[PDB]
């Protein structure tokens, strides 16, 4: 049992993905040749990225000695920061693959629906969705020490006459509502996506327009398979753990789901001309 | 991607001939084009994905061209060959290197063929 392992790995999210969203959020606000939807869409992921590495040494705190010594509001704030990023994130990728699959399947309506304007509307529709959950976790978070060893417990507290039933219920409403169906969702766009790339993969014919349009859904779909097989264990293990060396693949897990949020800067400069550029212009004027 | 020619020969007057172009992510415009040494290029046979074809005036009613979807390769048949043939037939190709990548223009090495014996 060595910690600084996954400590070390919390303290590279904690710097690293917080200087790559920043630069992501700050590249589009400024640049007008930036502000197009999908860019909208991959800018209010990065602000939940770049929410969620924050609190990243707050996470640390646990792992290195098993306690929460920070109190009941920063409880509070870390566990709707949580929630808010999860449920922020897949909401996003889902909006992003149905915008993805407008541009292609239905560019008669692309003119109408994907102006920034209404990418703006949806983000915050979005972010006021999912705080259904960010202020249900605000007001149950909360501190409770354990009678059996002295450790304080962060973690949401239901009734305890029914905290069994609760706490199956919501890890089974978030498994379905933040997993299951947007990922169906997503699954039906792209097989969509694919098939009409396919059928005028024969006899596709505007070049610029095309290639530009085809380059940002190849990389929408990588975003979205990395959160897939990023946010997948910890899901499961969670859902098996409720109804069902283990900790040993637990705090794995945990891990591999918060280094999701440094991956999507290095995936944009990768896989994107016009991010690349502007990250070269801004560490290299 | 490289793009392979065939069915180069000599071939006396009146004969047939089949050549054959193929690519190795898919082909969408797949033409032919000769030229001769003292006339400028110009295309002959010009298939789509869905089979429409477009033949010239003077190659009209004796060429045939046709797509196999299966192997990206084209054949097409000369009828009727006559010395007023004898060109460099030129493979002009559209294709996607990717399906994530734009769309480019192929152009085939070229081939001779003349009608003589």
């Known amino acids: 049992a060595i910690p600084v392992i996954i400590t070390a790995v919390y303290s590279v999210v904690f710097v690293v993905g917080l200087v790559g969203n920043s630069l992501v959020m700050f590249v589009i606000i400024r640049y007008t040749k930036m502000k197009t939807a999908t860019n909208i869409y991959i800018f209010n992921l990065a602000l939940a990225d770049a929410l969620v590495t924050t609190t990243m040494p707050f996470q640390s705190a646990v792992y290195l000695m098993n306690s929460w010594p920070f109190g009941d509001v920063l409880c509070k704030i870390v566990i709707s920061i949580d929630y808010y990023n999860m449920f922020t994130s897949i909401f996003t990728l889902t909006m992003m693959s149905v915008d993805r699959y407008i541009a292609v399947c239905h560019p008669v309506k692309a003119l109408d629906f994907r102006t920034p304007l209404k990418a703006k509307i949806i983000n915050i529709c979005i972010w006021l969705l999912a705080s259904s959950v960010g202020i249900s976790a605000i007001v149950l978070g909360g501190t409770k020490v354990r009678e059996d060893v002295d450790v304080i417990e962060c973690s949401l507290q239901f009734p305890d006459d029914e905290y069994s039933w609760w706490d199956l219920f919501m890890k089974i409403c978030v498994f379905v509502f933040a997993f299951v169906i947007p990922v169906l969702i997503i699954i039906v766009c792209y097989t969509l996506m694919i098939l009409r790339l396919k059928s005028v993969r024969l006899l596709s014919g505007s070049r610029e327009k095309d290639r530009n349009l085809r380059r940002i859904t190849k990389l929408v779909l990588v975003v979205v398979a990395v959160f897939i097989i990023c946010w997948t264990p910890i899901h499961i293990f969670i859902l098996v753990e409720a109804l069902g060396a283990a900790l040993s693949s637990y705090y794995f897990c945990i891990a591999l789901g918060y280094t999701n949020s440094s991956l999507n800067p290095v995936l944009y400069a990768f896989l994107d001309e016009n991010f690349k550029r502007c990250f070269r212009d801004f560490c290299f004027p | 991607r490289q793009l392979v020619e065939s069915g180069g020969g000599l071939v006396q007057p009146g004969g047939s001939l089949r050549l054959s172009c193929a690519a190795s992510?898919?082909?969408?415009?797949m033409g032919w084009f000769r030229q001769a040494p003292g006339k400028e290029r110009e295309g002959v046979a010009s298939?789509?994905?869905?089979?429409?074809?477009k033949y010239a005036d003077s190659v009209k009613g004796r060429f045939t061209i046709s797509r196999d979807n299966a192997k990206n390769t084209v054949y097409l048949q000369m009828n009727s060959l006559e010395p007023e043939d004898t060109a460099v037939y030129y493979c002009?190709?559209?294709?996607?290197?990717?399906?994530?990548?734009?769309?480019?223009?192929?152009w085939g090495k070229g081939t001779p063929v003349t009608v003589s014996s």
């Open positions: 002009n190709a559209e294709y996607r290197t990717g399906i994530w990548e734009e769309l480019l223009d192929g």
């Open positions: 992510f898919r082909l969408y415009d």
């Open positions: 298939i789509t994905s869905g089979g429409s074809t």
